[PDB]
Amino acid sequence: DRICTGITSSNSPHVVKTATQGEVNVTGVIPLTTTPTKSHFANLKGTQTRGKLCPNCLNCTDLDVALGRPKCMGTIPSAKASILHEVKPVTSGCFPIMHDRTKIRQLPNLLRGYENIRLSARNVTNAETAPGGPYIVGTSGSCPNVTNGNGFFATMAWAVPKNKTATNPLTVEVPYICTKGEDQITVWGFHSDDETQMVKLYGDSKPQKFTSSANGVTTHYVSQIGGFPNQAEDEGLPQSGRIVVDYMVQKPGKTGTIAYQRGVLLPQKVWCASGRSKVIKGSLPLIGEADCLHEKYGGLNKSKPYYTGEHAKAIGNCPIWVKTPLKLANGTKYRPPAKLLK
Amino acid sequence: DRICTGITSSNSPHVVKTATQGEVNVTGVIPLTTTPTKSHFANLKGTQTRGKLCPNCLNCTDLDVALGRPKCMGTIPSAKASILHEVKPVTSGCFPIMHDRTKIRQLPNLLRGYENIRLSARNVTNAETAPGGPYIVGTSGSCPNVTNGNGFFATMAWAVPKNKTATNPLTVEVPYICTKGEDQITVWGFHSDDETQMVKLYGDSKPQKFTSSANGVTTHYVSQIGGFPNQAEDEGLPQSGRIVVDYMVQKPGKTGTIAYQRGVLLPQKVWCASGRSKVIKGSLPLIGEADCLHEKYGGLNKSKPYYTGEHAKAIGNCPIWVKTPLKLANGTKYRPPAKLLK
Amino acid sequence: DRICTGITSSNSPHVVKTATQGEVNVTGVIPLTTTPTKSHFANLKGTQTRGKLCPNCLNCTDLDVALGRPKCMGTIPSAKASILHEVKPVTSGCFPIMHDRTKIRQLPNLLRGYENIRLSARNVTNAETAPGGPYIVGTSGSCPNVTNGNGFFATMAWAVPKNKTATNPLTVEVPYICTKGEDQITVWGFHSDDETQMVKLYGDSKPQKFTSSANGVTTHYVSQIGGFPNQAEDEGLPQSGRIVVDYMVQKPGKTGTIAYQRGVLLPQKVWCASGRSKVIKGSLPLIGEADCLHEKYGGLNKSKPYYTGEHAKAIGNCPIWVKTPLKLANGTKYRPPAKLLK
Amino acid sequence: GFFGAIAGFLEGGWEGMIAGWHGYTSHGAHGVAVAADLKSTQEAINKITKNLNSLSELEVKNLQRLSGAMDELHNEILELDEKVDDLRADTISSQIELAVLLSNEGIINSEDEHLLALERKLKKMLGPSAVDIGNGCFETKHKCNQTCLDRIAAGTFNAGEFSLPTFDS
Amino acid sequence: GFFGAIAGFLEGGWEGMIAGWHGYTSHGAHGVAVAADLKSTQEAINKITKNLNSLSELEVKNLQRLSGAMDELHNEILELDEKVDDLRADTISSQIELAVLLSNEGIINSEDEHLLALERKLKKMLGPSAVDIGNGCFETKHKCNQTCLDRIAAGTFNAGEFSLPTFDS
Amino acid sequence: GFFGAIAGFLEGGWEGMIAGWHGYTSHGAHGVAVAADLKSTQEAINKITKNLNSLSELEVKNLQRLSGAMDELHNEILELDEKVDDLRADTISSQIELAVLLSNEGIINSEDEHLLALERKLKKMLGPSAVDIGNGCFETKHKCNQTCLDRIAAGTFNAGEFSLPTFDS
Ligand SMILES: *[C@@H]1O[C@H](CO)[C@@H](O[C@@H]2O[C@H](CO)[C@@H](O)[C@H](O)[C@H]2NC(C)=O)[C@H](O)[C@H]1NC(C)=O
Ligand SMILES: *[C@@H]1O[C@H](CO)[C@@H](O[C@@H]2O[C@H](CO)[C@@H](O)[C@H](O)[C@H]2NC(C)=O)[C@H](O)[C@H]1NC(C)=O
Ligand SMILES: *[C@@H]1O[C@H](CO)[C@@H](O[C@@H]2O[C@H](CO)[C@@H](O)[C@H](O)[C@H]2NC(C)=O)[C@H](O)[C@H]1NC(C)=O
Ligand SMILES: *[C@@H]1O[C@H](CO)[C@@H](O[C@@H]2O[C@H](CO)[C@@H](O)[C@H](O)[C@H]2NC(C)=O)[C@H](O)[C@H]1NC(C)=O
Ligand SMILES: *[C@@H]1O[C@H](CO)[C@@H](O[C@@H]2O[C@H](CO)[C@@H](O)[C@H](O)[C@H]2NC(C)=O)[C@H](O)[C@H]1NC(C)=O
Ligand SMILES: *[C@@H]1O[C@H](CO)[C@@H](O[C@@H]2O[C@H](CO)[C@@H](O)[C@H](O)[C@H]2NC(C)=O)[C@H](O)[C@H]1NC(C)=O
Numbered sequence A, B, C: 001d002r003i004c005t006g007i008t009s010s011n012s013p014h015v016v017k018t019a020t021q022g023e024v025n026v027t028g029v030i031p032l033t034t035t036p037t038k039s040h041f042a043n044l045k046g047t048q049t050r051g052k053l054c055p056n057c058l059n060c061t062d063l064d065v066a067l068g069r070p071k072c073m074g075t076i077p078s079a080k081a082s083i084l085h086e087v088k089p090v091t092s093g094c095f096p097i098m099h100d101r102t103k104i105r106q107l108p109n110l111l112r113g114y115e116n117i118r119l120s121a122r123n124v125t126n127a128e129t130a131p132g133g134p135y136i137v138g139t140s141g142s143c144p145n146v147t148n149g150n151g152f153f154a155t156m157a158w159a160v161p162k163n164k165t166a167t168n169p170l171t172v173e174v175p176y177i178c179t180k181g182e183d184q185i186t187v188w189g190f191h192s193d194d195e196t197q198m199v200k201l202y203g204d205s206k207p208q209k210f211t212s213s214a215n216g217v218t219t220h221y222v223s224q225i226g227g228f229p230n231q232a233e234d235e236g237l238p239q240s241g242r243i244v245v246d247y248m249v250q251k252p253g254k255t256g257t258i259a260y261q262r263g264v265l266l267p268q269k270v271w272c273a274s275g276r277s278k279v280i281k282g283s284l285p286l287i288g289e290a291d292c293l294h295e296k297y298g299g300l301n302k303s304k305p306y307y308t309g310e311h312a313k314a315i316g317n318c319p320i321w322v323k324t325p326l327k328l329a330n331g332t333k334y335r336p337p338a339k340l341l342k
Numbered sequence D, E, F: 001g002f003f004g005a006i007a008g009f010l011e012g013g014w015e016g017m018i019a020g021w022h023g024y025t026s027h028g029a030h031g032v033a034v035a036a037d038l039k040s041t042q043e044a045i046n047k048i049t050k051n052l053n054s055l056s057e058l059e060v061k062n063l064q065r066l067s068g069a070m071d072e073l074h075n076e077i078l079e080l081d082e083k084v085d086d087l088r089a090d091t092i093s094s095q096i097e098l099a100v101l102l103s104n105e106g107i108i109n110s111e112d113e114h115l116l117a118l119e120r121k122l123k124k125m126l127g128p129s130a131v132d133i134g135n136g137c138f139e140t141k142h143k144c145n146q147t148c149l150d151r152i153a154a155g156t157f158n159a160g161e162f163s164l165p166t167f168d169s
C-alpha cells in the first residue's frame, strides 16, 4: 500500500509572472492593483488645504486678492497642501489690466507655493516722497472701497504727479521689508492713457519706458498710448486707460530696483511669504476628505499598495503607480487533475 | 557497489557574479550585452523621421525654411521622430542677418520639436494699416522670387514708411491666429542701415529701440547704425545693411506685443505647430532603417537586451544601457575533475 | 538512542526585516549603516580642491579676484573639486559697486564650476579706439596699484571721454578671443555719478541706458543719477559715485554685443575657462583629508557601504544614503531554548 | 517543478483535496484516498500574507509640483520636471515589478518544499516498518483507507493501530 | 555548494560526463562509470531560457531630448537634463545588475537541488534492496557497469534484471 | 521555518551549543548531549561574508552641484535640481532596502538547509544499522554520550567502535 505526498488541482484562472517558469496559472491571487475612478477633490487628511488663497475674502478671484483689491483683503493663513484650480487666473473687477503683457497672472499660483503668506505688515516706498516730484496718491473709482471711494490695489500706488512735467527715468530702490527669512513679492506697474488724458494727468503724451531689476532678473517695458484692447476682468468704464502690472520676487535680505517715468503704479503693500506647501493641479468645489489627491482621479483613498492607470502628480498617502496590474500568488501552480498514475 | 549523483567538470572560462558565492567560474554563459559600433542614422521603424524640416523645399537650410525665404517654402508635414543635425544652423542666402544677436538660429530646432508644423494659413498684422504711418511693404533683391523680384521672408514685412519721419515707440499687438490649441511661433526683426541710407529710407538716422513681450518673456534691442560685421549666410551685396531677426512663442490663446520704431521687420506669416516629436542629435545623410537611433552609435538594431558602452539619448526599440558587460549563467559552477574519491 | 540535527538558542537582540517571515530576531548582525557626525572639510583624495579661486592671490575675496582688482591678480589653476563657501560673495575693497542690481556676485561661483580658468591672454576691445570718441582709460584711486596709482579692474576699462558730449547708444561687438573651445566670461558695467560730476566727466547729466546681448540673453539697464545707497565692499570715499557691474557668458565661437552710452565700463581682460569641476556647498578653513565631502557632515571617510542621516550633495568615495538603518543577518533566527522534547 | 519533474514526483492535480493545497494521497484495495494537510497550507498562507505585508511597506516620495516654476513663464523647466516625474514613475514601477516577480518565483517554488516537508512528517509517523521510495511515497505493511489517511493529515496516526513498530517522542 | 560541502557531497568534477551537466557515477570491480541525465539538464536549460526571457521583457522609457529647451539659450536647463539622463541610466543599470545577480545566484544554487532530485529518481529505481548512504550515494546488492548505469540515466533500469525486489507504479 | 514546522522539526533553541549555530543533539540514558558543527557554521559565515562583499560593490553616481545654475538667478532650475537629488536618493535607497531584505530572507531561510545537510552527514557516518526517522533524527543501535557526539561534530565518528556496520570511502 502506498501513501504519498500530493498537491491539489483546482480552478486556476489567474495567471502570475515568474522568473524561472515564465507565466504560470495559479489557484488564487491577491491583487495589489486597482484602476481608481475619477472623483472630486477633498481635503488631504493630516495636512490643511488651500484652493482659495483666502476663504474670508468672499466673492473674489485669487488674482484679485493677490493684486490687493479693496474688498478682497481677507487675511489669509496657512495650508501645507494647496490645489491649483486656476491655471490662467482672472480678475473679477477693479481697474482694467492688460494682463497678457506680464507674468502677473501667476502671482496667486506663485503665492500658493508657500505655506505662509501675508498681506504685508507695512507699505514700502513713500508714495509722496517718491523720487520724481510730489505725487497725489492717485485713487480711482472703478475700484470701490469699504464705502465706495477710490480704490487702488493696496499692492501699489497710483503716482499722479502734481507739477505735470516730462521725466527722465527715475530709480526707486524697493527694500527688503520682511519678517525673518521670508520671501518678498513686490508688485507694481504703470498706468497709461490716451493722447489727451496723458498730458492732463502727467506732463507728457509720449510712450513711457519702465525697467526693473531684481536678483539678476531684468525686465523692460514701453507704455502704449493709443488703441488699447477692449477692457476685461474689470467693471465700469474708465476705459480711457489701462494698467500694465507686474511682480518682482525679492529673496531674503535683497533689494529691488524699479526705473520709471510717468504712470508709475509704485509698489505699496508687499507680500511676505514663506514655508513650502505641496501644490497640485486640482479642480475644486472641494468636497470632503481623501487620503490622497491625484491630479487626475482627484480625491482618492488608499486601498491597495499600487495602482494602475494614469500617472500624475499626487500628494498624501498615495498608492504607488505601476505599469501593469500586478497580482501576488496566493496558492498553487496549476496542475491538471491526475489519473496518470498506476 | 556504489551508484551516486554527480555533476560535470568541463572548460569553464566564463566568470559570473553571484551573491552568496562571490564571483564564480561557469561551464557556459548567455551574454546579454554588446558594445555596438558607430553606424549611420536610419529611419526609425514604427515612426516617421525628419532631418530636413522639409523634403520638397529643395536646396535650402532649415533656418532658411524657418525664416520663410522665397524658394524654400515647401509645405512640410509630420514625423514623430526628428533628428537634430544642425546644432547651430545656418542660412544659405537671402538678406544678410546678424544672427549671433538673437536666439533665432534655433527656430528650426524648436520647430523640429513638434509633430505638426505649418507655413501659416494667413498673415497676422496688416503691414499697411500697421501702427505708424502707411508703409510700403519693403521688398528686396538679395532675396530672389519665383520670378526674381523682391524677396522678403514670407515670415515678416519690411516696413519702409512713406512719410519718412522719426517715431516714438509704437506697439503692435500680435494676435493668436492658430487652428485649435497649436503653438504659434511669431517671427520678426528690424533692418538697420548706415547714416545716409537710414535717413533716406525712414526719417531718422539714430539707433532705434525695439522691445517684445510674450508670455512674460521680455526682450529689448537697440539697432546698430555704423560698421556692421562682414555679411554671411546671404548672397549678393546689399551690404549697406543687415536685419537683426528674432522669434516669439505664443502659447494657445495668447497675445504678443512688439514695441518698435524704424526698420521694423513686422511679422507676417506665422508658424502654427503642435504635436510632440521625439528628437535626437543625429548627423544625417539618412541611410535606410534601424530599430533604434542612438545619439552616438547611430542607426542600431536590437540584438541583446542590454548594451555596454557610451550612454546617450536614444529613441525607438533600444537596448537598455548597462555599466558593465553582464552574462547569464547557462551551466554549472566550475568543479575540478575528480579523483579525490575512494 | 536518538542523534538529531539542531540549531542554537542564544542572545538575539538584533532584529532583521525579511520577506516571508516578517521582522525576525537574530543571533548577530553586520551593520551596513552609520550616522556620520558633522566634521570640517578636507581635501578630496584622488582629486584637487578649490575654495579660493586663487591661493597665491593673498588677502582678497573671490569676487575681488573675479572682478580683476589690482593686487588680487594671482594666476589661478585647476582643481577637479571645488567648494562653494561664498553663497553671496563679497568684495573687500576697490571702487564701490551697487552689487544687488546684477547677477555679478555669482561670477566667482560660476567660475568655480570649471576645472581650468585663466586671467586672460589679452584684452578684447581697444578702450581708446572704442566706438564713441576717444576715451581716456579712466583710472581711479580707490583701487590701489602695485605702486598705488589708479586701479581699475583688469576686467574692464573706465571709458571717460575726451570731448565731453551726449551720446546716442553705441554698439561694441565683444569677440570670442579664447584658446580652443573654452568658455569666455566677459565682464563690464557702467559708472554713474551725481548731477555735477556727470557733466564734468562726460557731456551729459541724464540717466544713461545700457543693453547687452549674448547667446539670446538680453539685459537692459538705466543708470541712476542721484542718491546712491551707502558705499560698501569698497574702501575710501570716492563716494560721489558707483559702478553697476555685470558679466556676459560667451560660448565657444560666439560674439557678444553691448549697447552703451556714458559711464561705460568697457570690458578689457576677459576670462577663459573650461573643464568641469565637481562643486559642493562647503564651508572652509580647509583642514586635511577625507574620502568624501558631504554638504552637511563635511569631511567624511568611507567605513560602511551605506549611511543613515541627512541626505545632501556629496562627492568622492561616498557611502550611499539610505532611508533607515540596515543590518545584514550574521546568524540565526531566534529560537526559544528547548525542553519541548520527549 | 524542476525538482519534482527530475526526481519522479507526479505533476498530479488531485482535485478533491479541497480543505488544502497539499496533503497526501493513499493507494490500494480501497482505491485511492486523498487528504489535505491543514498546516502545510496555513503555513503556505502565512508566508504569502507576510510577503504581502512586506510588499506593502515600501514608501516613495510624494511627487508634487514645482512651487517656483510658473506655468506660462517657465515651460522649459516645467517640461524637464514632467520628464523627471515620468522617469521616476517608470523606474519605481520597474523595481516593484521586479520585487513582486521575485515574490511569485519564491511562492510558486516553495511548493515542492512543502511536499518535501510533508513527506518527512509522513516518514516519521508511518514508523520504521514502512519503505521510503524516493517518489514522495511510502510502501506500507498495512492497508490505509480514508480513515487511516485522515489521521495522517491530523497527525493522529499511530503505526501499532495495525500492530507495527513506532517512533515515540 | 554550502549544502554539498556540509552534507559530504563530492565537489567532484566528473569530466567525461559530456551529454549533460548532472547524472550519476558508478563504482566497483569495473572501476568507475559515468552517466549524464538528459532531463535534469534540459530541465536546467529550460529554467535558464525562461529566465533569459524574463530578463528580456523589462521596458524602460526611451530617454530623448527636451523639445522646448534650446541649445544656446537654455544651457542650465539642458545641463540639468543631462544630469537627469545620467542618473536614470545609472539607476536602471544598477537595478538590472541586481536582477541578473539574483538570477545567477539562483541558477548556480539550483545545481545541488538537481543533484538532490536525481538521487530520488535513483532511490526509487534501485529498489528497496539498496542502501541510501546520505552521501548522494547508494550501496547496491548487485554490480553496476556502464550498461547498467546507462539504463539509469534513461530510466530504463529494473532491479530484478539482477533478481532483486522492485517498486512498481 | 516553514519546512521544519511542517516536517516536524523542533523549533528548538539548544542553548549551550556555543561553538556554533548548528550541530547535533543526542538523547538517552546519559540525558541529552549537544554539539555544534564547526563547518556548517564557517560555511554559514562564508556565505554571509560574501553577501556583505556583494552588497558593498554597488556604485552610484556622485550627485553634485549644477555648475552653470546660479544661486540667486536660477532658483527654479535649482529647485528642480533638488527634486532630482531627492528622488534619486529615494529611488536608490528603496532598491538597496530591497537588495538587503532579499539577502536577509535568503540568509535566514538557508538555515533549515544546513540542518538538512548536517543530517546527511550524520546518516552516512551512523552507518546502515541506524534508522532515519524523517524528524531530522536517527534511532541508533548503540548509546551516544557526549564523547560519541563530539566525534560526530568532528567527523571522527566510526560505527564499529560499537561493533556495527560501516560505509567506507
Ligand atoms: C489559466 O489562465 C488563463 C487566463 O488567465 C485561462 O485562459 C483564459 O481564459 C479566459 C476566460 O475569460 C480569457 O480571459 C483568457 O484570454 C484566456 N487565456 C489567454 C490569456 O489567452 C486558462 O484557461 C487558465 N487555466 C488553465 C487551465 O490554464
Ligand atoms: C476615502 O476614505 C475616507 C475614509 O476616511 C472617506 O471619507 C469619509 O467618508 C465617509 C463616508 O462613509 C464619511 O462618513 C466621513 O465623514 C469621511 N471621513 C471621515 C472618517 O470623517 C472617503 O469618502 C473615501 N472615498 C473616497 C474615494 O474618497
Ligand atoms: C489566500 O487564499 C486563501 C484560500 O486559499 C484565503 O484563506 C481563506 O480565507 C478565509 C477568509 O477569507 C478563511 O476564513 C479561511 O480559513 C481560508 N480558507 C478557506 C475559506 O477555504 C486567504 O484569505 C487568501 N489571502 C491571503 C491574505 O492569504
Ligand atoms: C575561470 O575564469 C577565469 C577568467 O574568466 C580564467 O582565468 C583567466 O584566463 C583568461 C585567459 O585569457 C584571462 O583572460 C583572465 O585574465 C584569467 N583570469 C583572471 C581574470 O585573472 C580561469 O582560468 C577560468 N577557469 C578556472 C579553472 O578557474
Ligand atoms: C538592423 O536591422 C534591420 C532589419 O530590419 C536592417 O535593415 C534592413 O537591412 C537589410 C539588409 O539585409 C535590407 O535588406 C532591408 O531593406 C532593411 N530593412 C528591411 C527589413 O526592409 C539593418 O541594416 C540592421 N543593421 C543595422 C546596424 O542597422
Ligand atoms: C545553454 O547551453 C546549452 C548547452 O549546454 C545550449 O544547448 C545546446 O544547444 C544546442 C543549440 O545550440 C542544442 O541543439 C543542444 O540540444 C544543446 N546541447 C548540446 C549542443 O550539447 C543552449 O542553447 C544554451 N543557451 C540557452 C538558451 O540555454
Ligand SMILES: *[C@@H]1O[C@H](CO)[C@@H](O[C@@H]2O[C@H](CO)[C@@H](O)[C@H](O)[C@H]2NC(C)=O)[C@H](O)[C@H]1NC(C)=O
Pocket: C012, C013, C014, C015, C025, C026, C334
Ligand atoms: C528581539 O529584539 C527586540 C528588539 O530588537 C527585543 O526587545 C526589545 O528590547 C530592547 C531592549 O532595550 C528595546 O530596545 C526594544 O524596544 C524591544 N523591542 C521592541 C522594538 O519593542 C527582544 O527582546 C529581542 N529578543 C527576543 C527574545 O525577542
Ligand SMILES: *[C@@H]1O[C@H](CO)[C@@H](O[C@@H]2O[C@H](CO)[C@@H](O)[C@H](O)[C@H]2NC(C)=O)[C@H](O)[C@H]1NC(C)=O
Pocket: C039, C042, C288, C289, C290, C291, C299, C300, C301, C302
Ligand atoms: C578619514 O580617513 C583619513 C585616512 O586617510 C583620515 O586622514 C588621515 O588622518 C590621519 C590621522 O590618523 C593622518 O595621520 C593622515 O595624515 C591623514 N591622511 C593620510 C593617510 O595621510 C581622516 O582623518 C579620517 N577621518 C575623517 C572623519 O576625516
Ligand SMILES: *[C@@H]1O[C@H](CO)[C@@H](O[C@@H]2O[C@H](CO)[C@@H](O)[C@H](O)[C@H]2NC(C)=O)[C@H](O)[C@H]1NC(C)=O
Pocket: C028, C030, C330, C331, F045, F048, F049
Ligand atoms: C559574523 O558572526 C561571527 C560569530 O558568530 C563572527 O565570527 C567570529 O569572528 C571572530 C572574529 O571577530 C573569529 O575569530 C571567530 O572565528 C568567530 N567565532 C567566534 C569568535 O565565536 C564574524 O566575524 C561575524 N562577521 C562576519 C563578517 O561574518
Ligand SMILES: *[C@@H]1O[C@H](CO)[C@@H](O)[C@H](O)[C@H]1NC(C)=O
Pocket: A139, A145, A146, A147, A148, A149, A150, A151
Ligand atoms: C474709501 O475711500 C475714501 C476716499 O476715496 C477714503 O477716505 C476712505 O478711507 C475709504 N474707506 C475706508 C478705508 O474707510
Ligand SMILES: *[C@@H]1O[C@H](CO)[C@@H](O)[C@H](O)[C@H]1NC(C)=O
Pocket: B139, B145, B146, B147, B148, B149, B150, B151
Ligand atoms: C516676385 O516678385 C514680384 C515683384 O517683386 C511680384 O509681383 C511677384 O508676385 C513675385 N512672383 C510671384 C509670386 O509670382
Ligand SMILES: *[C@@H]1O[C@H](CO)[C@@H](O)[C@H](O)[C@H]1NC(C)=O
Pocket: C139, C145, C146, C147, C148, C149, C150, C151
Ligand atoms: C600703477 O599706477 C600707475 C599710474 O596710475 C601706472 O603707470 C603703473 O604702471 C602702475 N603700476 C605698475 C603696473 O607698475
Ligand SMILES: *[C@@H]1O[C@H](CO)[C@@H](O)[C@H](O)[C@H]1NC(C)=O
Pocket: D030, D145, D146, D147, D148
Ligand atoms: C478502514 O478500515 C477500518 C477497519 O480496518 C474500518 O473500521 C473503516 O470503516 C475503514 N474506512 C473506510 C471508510 O473504508
Ligand SMILES: *[C@@H]1O[C@H](CO)[C@@H](O)[C@H](O)[C@H]1NC(C)=O
Pocket: E030, E145, E146, E147, E148
Ligand atoms: C555489464 O555486465 C553484463 C553482464 O552482467 C554484460 O552483458 C555487459 O557487457 C557489461 N558491460 C560492460 C561494457 O562492461
Ligand SMILES: *[C@@H]1O[C@H](CO)[C@@H](O)[C@H](O)[C@H]1NC(C)=O
Pocket: F030, F145, F146, F147, F148
Ligand atoms: C561515553 O562512554 C564511554 C564508554 O562506552 C566512556 O569511555 C566515556 O567516558 C563516556 N563519556 C561520558 C563523558 O559520559
